[PDB]
Nucleic acid binder design. Structure first.
Lengths: 83, 82, 82, 20, 94
DNA sequence: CACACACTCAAAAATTAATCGATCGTATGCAAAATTTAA
DNA sequence: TTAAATTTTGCATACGATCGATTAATTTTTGAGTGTGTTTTTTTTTTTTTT
């Protein structure tokens, strides 16, 4: 949508896209591209409190925020830089 | 003065490239050139520098037209806001 | 403001601010902090004043003379003072 | 690099006195 | 009083003998890209044949304006689109 | 006296941005079943 | 040796992404219509005043 607007908007499009590709080409081989994504259809999971308690033993967490971590792990995705 | 001397050198190079296109003779010194495509036709241009090189003559033939396309403008609506 | 004996009103405004500042933090009424906001707002008015924009009426067609100037300056005021 | 307010009052009064 | 329509780049204009069939007939003969020439001469030789073709086809518009109206007509006219797919289909058939 | 020179202007239509519509790419639910493990 | 649990894979399907077809504003042009400026001064001769 940049081409309709003024020259300064388009120059900022240049500098922003150059910065985006420069900061994302650093992770082409390192592969560390875990990203919180928006899930669309059902992502509901029947929780297991044994799994919850062993995660409590693992990362030293209360189970309410461990339920928060368990929910937030389900929306985590990975992006491809070629994509 | 260092940056000024570099700016005058840049202006001198651009002025030299401009006066490459400028005719050596005066304005009333009339020179007419008929160019042909390999499809046989006659197109007339008026100039002295355009006599020798094809590109200046074709730039004249592009610039001799008086019809300009519409270029729509956003009208700079940012100034409407405070 | 900027030209009257190199802006002594700026020193007057900061003196009105340090009238507030000399009082302790617990003894300062909110009116004194509003006076501080008044001084900071005065400095933002001094900085923020810029030359205006040239607005034209586009209902009528633009004549052959066109826009001759977009200068929006007072007589004694130049671009260096602003 | 903290700037003190009492230093600004002292500099204000001193530059009122002689202005250098 | 309707006296005249002002002419624009149309579907019948591209499908004439003087048009895109002229391009298919003579573009490979006229265009020469050589590594010995510098890039300015190569690019100007690319522009020159298309500029003469534009000044034979639609002389009312300037050449950048001619490329803009070709972009508009290529986005708009469906006869030009089926001609453009017909060229590709005819060359992949052989 | 009419003949160019310049000023002004309702309508026409190219241009262009906006608004659905068709088609394709994709993620997810479902049916079957090949494999592994137990008695 | 044979039956049940399980996870994988193929397939159908619905939903979003994206280009395309259409269409309504718009604003520049579009010459069409109309108001108006125009020949053009020119030495030549007389008479007077000072030189």
């Amino acid at each position: 949508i940049g081409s309709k607007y003024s020259l300064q908007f388009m120059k900022s499009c240049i500098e922003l896209t150059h910065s985006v590709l420069k900061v994302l080409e650093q992770y082409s081989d390192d592969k560390t591209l875990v990203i919180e994504g928006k899930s669309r259809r059902q992502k509901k999971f029947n929780i297991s409190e044994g799994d919850i308690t062993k995660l409590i033993e693992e990362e030293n967490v209360d189970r309410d925020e461990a339920l928060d971590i368990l929910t937030s792990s389900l929306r985590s995705i990975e992006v491809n830089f070629q994509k | 003065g260092f940056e000024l001397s570099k700016l005058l050198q840049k202006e001198h190079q651009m002025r030299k490239n401009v006066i490459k296109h400028t005719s050596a003779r005066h304005s009333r010194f009339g020179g007419l050139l008929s160019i042909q495509t390999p499809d046989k036709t006659r197109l007339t241009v008026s100039g002295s520098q355009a006599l020798v090189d094809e590109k200046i003559a074709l730039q004249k033939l592009d610039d001799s037209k008086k019809w300009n396309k519409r270029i729509i403008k956003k009208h700079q609506s940012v100034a409407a806001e405070g | 403001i900027l030209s009257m004996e190199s802006g002594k009103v700026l020193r007057a405004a900061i003196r009105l601010a340090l009238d507030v500042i000399k009082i302790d933090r617990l003894s300062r009424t909110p009116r004194d902090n509003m006076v501080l906001k008044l001084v900071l707002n005065f400095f933002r008015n001094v900085i923020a004043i810029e030359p205006g924009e040239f607005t034209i009426n586009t209902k009528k067609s633009m004549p052959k003379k066109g826009i001759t100037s977009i200068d929006t300056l007072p007589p004694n005021v130049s671009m260096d003072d602003i | 690099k903290f700037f003190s307010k009492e230093s600004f009052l002292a500099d204000f009064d001193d530059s009122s006195s002689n202005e250098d | 009083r309707k006296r005249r329509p002002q002419v624009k780049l149309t579907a019948e204009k591209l499908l004439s003998d003087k048009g895109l069939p002229y391009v298919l007939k003579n573009a490979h003969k006229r265009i020469r890209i050589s590594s010995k020439k510098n890039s300015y001469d190569n690019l100007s030789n690319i522009i020159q044949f298309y500029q003469l073709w534009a000044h034979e086809l639609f002389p009312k518009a300037k050449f950048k304006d001619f490329m803009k109206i070709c972009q508009t007509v290529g986005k708009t006219d469906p006869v030009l689109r089926e001609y453009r797919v017909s060229l590709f289909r005819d060359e992949m058939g052989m």
